[PDB]
Amino acid sequence: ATVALDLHILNANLDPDGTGARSAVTAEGTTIAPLITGNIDDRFQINVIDQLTDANMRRATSIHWHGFFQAGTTEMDGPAFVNQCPIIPNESFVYDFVVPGQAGTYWYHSHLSTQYCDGLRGAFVVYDPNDPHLSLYDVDDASTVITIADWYHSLSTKAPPAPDTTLINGLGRNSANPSAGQLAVVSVQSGKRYRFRIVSTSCFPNYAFSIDGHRMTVIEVDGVSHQPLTVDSLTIFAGQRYSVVVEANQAVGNYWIRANPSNGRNGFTGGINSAIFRYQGAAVAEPTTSQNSGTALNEANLIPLINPGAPGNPVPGGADINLNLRIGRNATTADFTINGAPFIPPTVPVLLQILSGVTNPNDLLPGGAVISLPANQVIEISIPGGGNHPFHLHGHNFDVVRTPGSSVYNYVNPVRRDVVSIGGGGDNVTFRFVTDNPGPWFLHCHIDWHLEAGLAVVFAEDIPNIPIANAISPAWDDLCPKYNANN
Ligand SMILES: [Cu+2]
Ligand SMILES: [Cu+2]
Ligand SMILES: [Cu+2]
Ligand SMILES: [Cu+2]
């Protein structure tokens, strides 16, 4: 999908494992939203046409372009009742933003309730004509993009026990009977090197990713190019994205591509949680290859390519702004808490209350879930390792100066990305960013069912500069009036 494109949103009855069709939310006709691409600095004009009719899900919609900074285009970011009011059925809205200096692997998904778990999700790649990693691969195209998703047999409409089927490129098996399901085939040729862009479109579990008999060389992490680091296995979290170069150097043949979920049926019995890596000329056949070898990816081992300074001073507590975020709960699942306040979405989108003249955070809503950050400042965020939550910051990436699983602080060359697991009981994951982006920017667990429960806070960054920095098209202006009239 192009730079100026339409993108109808519509239900359709999909049956990705062969077990039984279900009514889902999607873009166009596919269980994986259609790949979108451009180039660095391109200007996207993405006409979303809401055409939804299944009243058992949500029929409104709002799309987020994950990992794009949206500087000057905060109204386009996508979060429901943060940056916009939802688009109504029988209406449309053109998200129009630029991607100045960002090439890499992103994705896009609904950001209204848990509606992306009913289907609205897919890949977004921004190529770099001048990419420093070009020499490390012969192939990078629509065929080298690899999506993982957790699929639900029942409409979204809690903390659901777990997903039902792991789909790779929208395909995979389940145990109604695994044989009911197709396997996704990623095709390669001997001697060729491939930039696979691996996209977790997941609403919840993390996956342990691997390619039987093959090594993976990491060059890119959540949009950002890193020094080439070679591994055999990988855990990818909700919303995360890695590029890995895979050389087809083993014996011509079939090989399992593995994706072990953190929740739901795990393991590979029957070929669940799998896909096929097949060589030109191999038999059209089911793999029989055995899984992985030692060298797992450790986040603490990735280094950003182009010289990044973990902003600020190299002491924890050394940023200009140090906030410590602690997570609280609630029995069932409808009230998560951070520093004693759940995220409860207001009727007035936080961008709206601000543009309107509500500048003191104290008066913003919801109460306490919103923190104002001052401009051109260095921020240190710590989140006491709760229970494996993949936290995601909008409008920015960050240096994770303390990686899940390592008592050290690294201000020298920490990983930079935009989704990070807080690990659990033992961890104190901390990162740092710079508030150079006037905007109300979300920070939430990317476990979709946790955000729906209130696990989230809104960063109202450079409040004085938001109306000025952001130029608001009349079409943004009537989302809320047309939504608030609904029925
Ligand atoms: Cu996302
Ligand atoms: Cu995002
Ligand atoms: Cu979570
Ligand atoms: Cu978000």
- Tell me, in angstroms, the distance from the centre of ligand 2 to residue 393's CA: 6
Tokens describing residue 240 = 């995360």
Resolution of the deposited coordinates, in angstroms? 1.7
H helix runs in 293-364, sequence order: 350-356
359 CB neighbour count, 10 Å cutoff: 15
- Tell me, in angstroms, the distance from the centre of ligand 2 to residue 179's CA: 36
- Tell me, in angstroms, the distance from the centre of ligand 1 to residue 64's CA: 7
- Tell me, in angstroms, the distance from the centre of ligand 3 to residue 159's CA: 10
| Closest listed ligand to the CA of 70 | 2
| Closest listed ligand to the CA of 109 | 1
- Tell me, in angstroms, the distance from the centre of ligand 4 to residue 219's CA: 24
Residues 6 or more apart whose Cβ sits within 8 Å of residue 239:
66, 107, 200, 202, 390, 392, 418, 419, 446
- Tell me, in angstroms, the distance from the centre of ligand 4 to residue 456's CA: 9
- Tell me, in angstroms, the distance from the centre of ligand 4 to residue 80's CA: 9
Tokens describing residue 455 = 């696990």
| Closest listed ligand to the CA of 116 | 1
- Tell me, in angstroms, the distance from the centre of ligand 2 to residue 67's CA: 5
Return d(Cα 487, Cα 482) in angstroms, integer: 10
Return d(Cα 391, Cα 380) in angstroms, integer: 14
Which domains does the chain carry?
A: 1-129 (2.60.40.420), 130-306 (2.60.40.420), 307-487 (2.60.40.420)
- Tell me, in angstroms, the distance from the centre of ligand 2 to residue 113's CA: 14
- ω into 366 cis (within 30 of 0): yes
| Closest listed ligand to the CA of 80 | 4
Handedness of CA 460, 466, 470, 473 (dihedral sign): positive
Return d(Cα 466, Cα 333) in angstroms, integer: 34
| Closest listed ligand to the CA of 107 | 1
- Tell me, in angstroms, the distance from the centre of ligand 3 to residue 183's CA: 30
- Tell me, in angstroms, the distance from the centre of ligand 2 to residue 66's CA: 4
Which H or E element spans position 200?
strand 193-200
Are 11 and 26 in contact by the 8 Å Cβ rule? The answer is yes
Return d(Cα 246, Cα 139) in angstroms, integer: 10
Which residue, among 463, 462, 441, 459, has the nearest Cα to 355 in the 3D structure? Answer: 463
Tokens describing residue 216 = 């993976």
Return d(Cα 415, Cα 305) in angstroms, integer: 10
| Closest listed ligand to the CA of 385 | 3
Tokens describing residue 67 = 């990992």
Q: How far apart are the first and last CA of the chain?
A: 33
Cα-Cα-Cα-Cα torsion 424, 427, 432, 438, nearest 10 degrees, comes to: 30
Say how many CA atoms lie within 13 Å of 469 toward its Cβ: 19
Residues 6 or more apart whose Cβ sits within 8 Å of residue 331:
none
- Tell me, in angstroms, the distance from the centre of ligand 1 to residue 8's CA: 20
Are 40 and 102 in contact by the 8 Å Cβ rule? The answer is yes
- Tell me, in angstroms, the distance from the centre of ligand 3 to residue 453's CA: 9
Which residue, among 87, 39, 42, has the nearest Cα to 64 in the 3D structure? Answer: 87
| Closest listed ligand to the CA of 111 | 4
Q: How was this structure determined?
A: X-ray
- Tell me, in angstroms, the distance from the centre of ligand 1 to residue 293's CA: 30
Planar angle of CA 353, 354, 358, nearest 5 degrees = 75
Tokens describing residue 125 = 């790649």
Return d(Cα 223, Cα 214) in angstroms, integer: 23
| Closest listed ligand to the CA of 447 | 3
| Closest listed ligand to the CA of 238 | 1
| Closest listed ligand to the CA of 120 | 1
- Tell me, in angstroms, the distance from the centre of ligand 1 to residue 239's CA: 5
DSSP strands (E only) in 332-411: 337-338, 370-373, 378-384, 390-393, 398-402
